[PDB]
């Protein structure tokens, strides 16, 4: 939001779709995807400073 540390926010992972082969598909490149998912969860939850 404003490059500040997050506090008092439980990001509940509802449903996920994993790759069948982590060596063939993306297995180590899911952490920026998880960071983008956490950013979209924090942005779409009506935040407050």
């Amino acid at each position: 939001l404003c490059d500040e540390l997050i506090r008092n926010v439980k990001f509940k992972i509802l449903d996920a779709v994993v790759a069948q082969e982590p060596l063939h598909r993306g297995g180590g490149q899911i952490i920026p995807t998880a960071r983008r998912v956490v950013y979209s969860a924090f942005l779409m939850a009506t935040p407050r400073l």
Binding site: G26, G27, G28, Q29, I31, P32, R35
Partner: protein, 95 residues
């Protein structure tokens, strides 16, 4: 290694440097040895690379920032997936 530029034609020597294919050909013609190590190298020994960043070891794409952070963390230099040693220098940046 030598030019500090993007390789026109990527290659690698057993030294394991990323000096495209310029530096190696010149050193082989003059010395017949690898410029870094000074060990004998032939043209045949050179390995040519086939023509968002990618790690050579994992051969996986990553956010550039994420890759750099893993390479330089507490002893997490190698590579998140493989845990094979990997440096910032040998990260390939895709245009």
């Amino acid at each position: 290694s030598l030019s500090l530029q993007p390789f026109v034609y990527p290659v690698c020597t057993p030294d394991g440097i990323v000096f495209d294919l310029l530096n190696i050909v010149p050193w082989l013609k003059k010395y017949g040895t690898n410029p870094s190590n000074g060990e004998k190298l032939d043209g045949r020994s050179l390995i040519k690379l086939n023509f968002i960043v990618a790690v050579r070891t994992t051969g996986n794409v990553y956010a550039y920032e994420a890759v750099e952070q893993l390479n330089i963390k507490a002893k997490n230099f190698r590579d998140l997936l493989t845990d094979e040693p990997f440096s910032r220098q040998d990260i390939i940046t895709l245009q």
